Design a protein around this ligand. Structure first.
Ligand SMILES: *[C@@H]1O[C@H](CO)[C@@H](O[C@@H]2O[C@H](CO)[C@@H](O)[C@H](O)[C@H]2NC(C)=O)[C@H](O)[C@H]1NC(C)=O
Ligand SMILES: *[C@@H]1O[C@H](CO)[C@@H](O[C@@H]2O[C@H](CO)[C@@H](O)[C@H](O)[C@H]2NC(C)=O)[C@H](O)[C@H]1NC(C)=O
Ligand SMILES: *[C@@H]1O[C@H](CO)[C@@H](O)[C@H](O)[C@H]1NC(C)=O
Ligand SMILES: *[C@@H]1O[C@H](CO)[C@@H](O)[C@H](O)[C@H]1NC(C)=O
Ligand SMILES: *[C@@H]1O[C@H](CO)[C@@H](O)[C@H](O)[C@H]1NC(C)=O
Ligand SMILES: *[C@@H]1O[C@H](CO)[C@@H](O)[C@H](O)[C@H]1NC(C)=O
Ligand SMILES: *[C@@H]1O[C@H](CO)[C@@H](O)[C@H](O)[C@H]1NC(C)=O
Lengths: 540, 262, 540
């Protein structure tokens, strides 16, 4: 089993404590109260920080001091009645508040916002400019979780809201759901564990004719034997209109899922099954891909891995054979194509063989019945290179969040990957070009001095937004958001040896300053970087 | 099928290949038995060699019967030529499909270390005939001897094959007459042996071995009459021996063959 | 997932290099050649060191210097012809020698010895006193491996030799076998992977009416799905006489096996499947048990565990329901008792319901046919306490060998366990009394200065013999055998704090010397030890 490589550079808390931190202060400055940050997102040129009771906005471009200040603040607190109901049902006082868990650009002037609202999920529209709500509050059921600790997906496509969460206080009814957008609402079949079995929702992307959902769930493949969690990707047709009067009315007619394969192959293959995070679709080396982080189960020796998946290999798995169980007592086997109905289950109305069908409502019953009973594909999606790009199996924490710069370097053609973790440690590696990886940097970015207050010391990275234009990776914790420079170039001062040995796409030795600096595609200046090797041949 | 082997001076032996009726522990699928000149011999039809660990026989593994329902090996034909005996078999393909094979043993090899088995068949015009129906050993005749670049008195195996590898019980009419010079069969086996003794690949005989087994590289010269050692055996192979297709039909299925030279 | 506890004391190579080492020298002293030690065993008062070409004997009781000397030497080299045949078949020159892999007391005057003999296994009898052979050499086929690197079992019971190894040069035909002892030879069914599937043989014990075999093998339970290795225990009846004319003639009629359960239970259980070692039967806390070390698969994040098994829980599993596969395509399920023949498969002739049967030869066919086709039990053997006694999941090496002192302390009633590893590191823990464990000591005993010679530095512990009477644990490496004191008592000199905090059963503070010393059940002197706690309340 492959050993953990060493990073070229290590940035200790000693160094990184100088990175600017946001803790919700306006300019001018007094005792701090925990922020309970939920998520961060950059849209346009504004950094949005979703939290308890509030969304804070940060002006990314004019932030130029030791402390990152708040520009504007949205305020949405739960009514007392809702808080009371929440407490009455046995939830702790700290849980019974409005935690913002959905924040999306609806259009150029409108934010779509949902909050747990003390275990009574609710949704509202806000003017982007004034951050004031307009129109009426409306249900967040199936759109926003009740519990701020739960993972959830929300995404707009062509005006329609795709969401994955639970519909009920007790969180028994997990669902993948679509509403709004002048289209019918659709959901996964309630209480059908062949569709979903205790899922943990991770990510959704809009790609082509489909929305793809990434999640993990209990694997029915292992029904017999023990409980095992598998990672999944699932497709739905963007144009789904639901089933007929007789089958899958008001449900998806295009829902299929498949195991993702993240493994180190061997005498026996070693799988990383616990999906932690997935990027948006990224163009890399001429291919549309996502990157994903996986860990081993919590009741096991801890390990993390990063695998990449080509959107074509994903599309491909859904053209293959379906899985089935010939009997409550048999193993799962592929369905022979001869037994697959026409039109093919999972193909969108108005597709090649299906121009005859104006909408899914007109699909025949044998097709709808088949997909209702065979949501699972036989094969697993292969990873690019058929093994992880990156491994960590010698640390006590897990890799979680992931961000990617696919245009790093003077020539904007290197792929650098940033990896967050449970312990506030960021990892940086270069994707060789798509085979392998080089471990550039490990850094401790959690700042106890700015972030450990009001009795909270929680080093879990809750989100990362990479922003090329400001040269930064914004890293969210529960109590603070940190601005981290993409590179530590100027750090090497006048030591050319260290600069060149860094082998870092962002960095190079400039012969006009006699110093190491970050390189920009606008620089007409002459630089020196050896990335393909770190040949020093002293000393500093 | 059986083949009697007895030279001047030797007492005699009988090679028998047979289906075993899923009774793999009762009956060897292939073996050598004594066939003494004296009918009253106390050794008549005993195994040529019987030891606790090494006997002159091959048994079908339980594993194979477990993998394929009603798995069995059918022995269509058998013959002696030069220093070897040959058996032609049909059997289900271990993970329906059937595989027709040539099995070769040294005439003098009581430990059965010489066992080699290779698939065979023929093709013509995009059509593959890989399901053996019948066979017959004979001389080539002048035309075939030329085509095969062999001498007039060298042996040639003539065979009937049905189309494809499926439908053993209900073959289509599409069938072919094919010829295999013994010389090319032996040559392709020798080369398989040499490749294996150079350490290339695996024995490739899943049905008998029950697992992938690596070829062992070893300083052993392989000649036309190599008779095996306890390494690199029993020996299989995935690449078919191709015969020269002589005649095809799609109308009335070919069922038998005999041949001579006039 | 539980973290690794810290040891109370750590003995670095600095300290342990003073332990006496055997490297095959007679008294008097010259360049060293690798010994290629295979195994060690103490019988009577002599330590036997089985190696290439030789068995070395050490006089345990009169060994009192920095170097452990050889007393006597058995010499058995392969004939040149056998060496030639071995090389001709492509084996490396270093492999084509006689490696001693079986050494057993046949009776008070006779050693039974088998050697690989250059891939031509062979067996011989030796006079214990003179270490000279008498009588003729005879076959080692099925009794001794061809390959010195292969694991094998050999054991005498009532004059009969029980052995597990491969019968063939190519090592395809793995077997559990019995011969000699004026009894019929028996073997497992050749080429039946329901009986054995690529097994790795670990240990056998003689207990009651049975011999129990411990091994690992590919699990047919996971046929569908991937290749997975499971640990097993298997029974055979000591009085087995083989089957009838029609069924299992010359084969075991009493062979049954079962999965061993070594796991940390949780949301999903985490199994340690790769069985490394197993002790002999040990009386502990009024129970007959074995202890076993398990690791994770080699293609996985490394981890080791120690579980204990009660001989009654083992016997018990073999009374339960058999496993079966209702079809080549179904999962493995329990066989209903109604379908189990009478007499019961696996019960010994002349047992309770079976006095009617003089020997297994007279067993009925439905019984023999059933056991021939159902060697596997449905249930797994539970471990004592239903979890490991000890875990190591933060190191790069695996736990392997195991030795146990079940009579440690002034009152000979503590259970101390010694654990070897791949890196020459010994671990020492106390078994709480049978719940849990306390981590007393970690020590590096490999001695580079004495053991790293002739180009070999191999830190793998190949055997351990605990010898109470000499107060020592003898630890075998490929090139050397080390004598390690059971306790490091006198080490604490006059520091009572350290002595008491050691919490070590062997150690105590003696008030007559004002010093820490090892305690013996013969000592009339007054001691002080606090094992149930290490309360110091300074300083040294
Ligand atoms: C996960 O990916 C690995 C790597 O492609 C797969 O491993 C291969 O398995 C096939 C058989 O299906 C073998 O032919 C290859 O040799 C294997 N690759 C290697 C390098 O060992 C693995 O099967 C995949 N797992 C699943 C469930 O699909
Ligand atoms: C291995 O041992 C563990 C511990 O006994 C078993 O875990 C139990 O499984 C049963 C169901 O069979 C549950 O009722 C118990 O609650 C489990 N114990 C705990 C503490 O979780 C496990 O099933 C065993 N594995 C096998 C294959 O037998
Ligand atoms: C994005 O930011 C610019 C200013 O940089 C602003 O003028 C514009 O309104 C924003 N674009 C929109 C509305 O998406
Ligand atoms: C990136 O592009 C530049 C030239 O455009 C080249 O020098 C460098 O080698 C390229 N690196 C790649 C292909 O990743
Ligand atoms: C045919 O055989 C002869 C010798 O028998 C040989 O010289 C010649 O190479 C062969 N013909 C070919 C292969 O062209
Ligand atoms: C064991 O050792 C004693 C000496 O301590 C010796 O006299 C005796 O022969 C040995 N016992 C036997 C033969 O098992
Ligand atoms: C061991 O025995 C002695 C008395 O015989 C006692 O003091 C000590 O507590 C015992 N420890 C055990 C039971 O393990």
């Amino acid at each position: 089993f492959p050993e953990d490589s060493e990073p070229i550079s290590i940035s200790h808390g000693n160094y990184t404590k100088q990175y600017p931190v946001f803790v919700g202060h306006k300019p001018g400055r007094t005792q701090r109260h925990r922020l309970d940050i939920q998520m961060i997102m950059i849209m346009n040129r504004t950094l949005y920080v979703a939290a308890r009771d509030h969304i804070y906005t940060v002006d990314i471009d004019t932030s130029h001091t030791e402390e990152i200040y708040c520009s504007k603040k949205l305020t949405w607190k739960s009514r007392q009645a809702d808080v009371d109901t929440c407490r009455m049902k046995g939830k702790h006082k700290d849980e019974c508040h409005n935690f913002i868990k959905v924040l999306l650009k609806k259009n150029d002037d409108t934010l779509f916002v949902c909050g747990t609202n003390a275990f009574n999920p609710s949704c509202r529209n806000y003017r982007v400019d004034t951050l004031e709500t307009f129109g009426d509050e409306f249900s967040g059921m199936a759109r926003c979780p009740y519990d701020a600790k739960h993972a959830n997906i929300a995404l707009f496509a062509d005006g329609k809201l795709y969401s994955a969460t639970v519909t009920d206080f007790l969180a028994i009814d997990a669902v993948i759901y679509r509403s709004l957008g002048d289209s019918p609402t659709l959901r996964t079949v309630k209480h059908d564990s062949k569709w979903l079995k205790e899922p943990y929702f991770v990510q959704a992307v809009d790609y082509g004719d489909y929305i793809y959902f990434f999640f993990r769930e209990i694997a029915v493949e292992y029904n017999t034997m023990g409980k095992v969690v598998f990672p999944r990707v699932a497709q739905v047709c963007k144009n789904d209109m639901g089933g007929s009067q007789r089958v899958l009315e008001k449900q998806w007619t295009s829902f299929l899922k498949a195991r993702l394969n993240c493994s180190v192959p061997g005498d026996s293959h070693f799988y990383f099954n616990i999906l932690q995070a997935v990027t948006d679709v990224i163009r890399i080396n001429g291919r549309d891909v996502v990157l994903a982080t996986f860990s081993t189960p919590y009741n096991s020796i801890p390990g993390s891995a990063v695998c990449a998946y080509d959107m074509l290999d994903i599309a491909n798995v859904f053209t293959g054979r379906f899985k089935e169980q010939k009997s409550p007592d048999s193993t799962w086997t592929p369905v022979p194509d001869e037994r697959v109905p026409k039109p093919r289950p999972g193909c969108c109305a108005g597709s090649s063989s299906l121009e005859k069908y104006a909408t899914s409502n007109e699909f025949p019953d044998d097709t709808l019945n088949f997909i209702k009973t065979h949501p699972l594909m036989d094969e697993a999606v292969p990873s690019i290179i058929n093994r992880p790009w990156f491994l960590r199996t010698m640390v006590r924490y897990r890799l979680t969040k992931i961000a990617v710069d696919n245009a790093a370097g003077p020539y904007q053609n290197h792929t650098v990957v940033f990896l967050g973790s449970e312990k506030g440690i960021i990892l940086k590696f270069l994707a060789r070009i798509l085979n392998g990886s080089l471990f550039l940097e490990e850094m401790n970015v959690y700042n106890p001095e700015k972030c450990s207050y009001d009795g909270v010391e929680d080093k879990r990275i809750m989100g990362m937004q990479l922003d090329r234009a400001s040269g930064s990776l914004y890293v969210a914790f529960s109590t603070c958001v940190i601005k981290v420079p993409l590179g530590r170039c100027e750090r090497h001062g006048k030591c050319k040896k260290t600069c060149i040995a860094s082998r870092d796409p962002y960095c190079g030795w400039v012969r006009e300053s006699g110093s190491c600096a970050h390189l920009s595609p606008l620089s007409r200046l002459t630089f020196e970087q050896d990335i393909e090797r770190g040949n020093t041949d002293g000393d500093c | 099928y059986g083949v009697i082997v007895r030279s001047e001076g030797e007492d005699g032996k009988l090679f028998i290949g047979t289906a075993v009726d899923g009774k793999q522990d009762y009956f060897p699928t292939l073996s050598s038995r004594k066939l003494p000149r004296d009918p009253e011999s106390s050794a008549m039809l005993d195994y040529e060699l019987h030891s606790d660990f090494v006997s002159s026989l091959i048994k079908i593994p339980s594993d194979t019967l477990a993998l394929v329902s009603h798995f069995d090996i059918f022995y269509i034909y058998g013959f002696a030529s030069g220093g070897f005996v040959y058996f032609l078999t049909v059997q289900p393909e271990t993970p329906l499909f059937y595989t027709s094979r040539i099995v070769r043993l040294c005439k003098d090899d009581p430990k059965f270390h010489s066992y080699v088995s290779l698939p065979f068949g023929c093709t013509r015009a995009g059509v593959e005939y890989r399901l053996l129906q019948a066979a017959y050993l004979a001389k080539p005749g002048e035309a075939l001897a030329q085509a095969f670049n062999i001498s007039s008195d060298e042996d040639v195996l003539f065979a009937i094959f049905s189309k494809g590898q499926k439908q053993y019980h209900h073959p289509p009419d599409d069938s072919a007459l094919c010829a295999f010079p013994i010389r090319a069969i032996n040559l392709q086996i020798k080369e398989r042996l040499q490749s294996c003794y150079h350490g290339e690949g695996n024995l490739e005989l899943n049905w008998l071995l029950g697992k992938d087994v690596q070829c062992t590289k070893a300083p052993v010269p392989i000649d036309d009459n190599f008779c095996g050692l306890d390494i690199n055996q029993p020996l299989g192979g995935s690449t078919p021996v191709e015969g020269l297709t002589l005649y095809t039909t799609s109308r009335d299925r070919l069922t038998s063959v005999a041949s001579y030279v006039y």
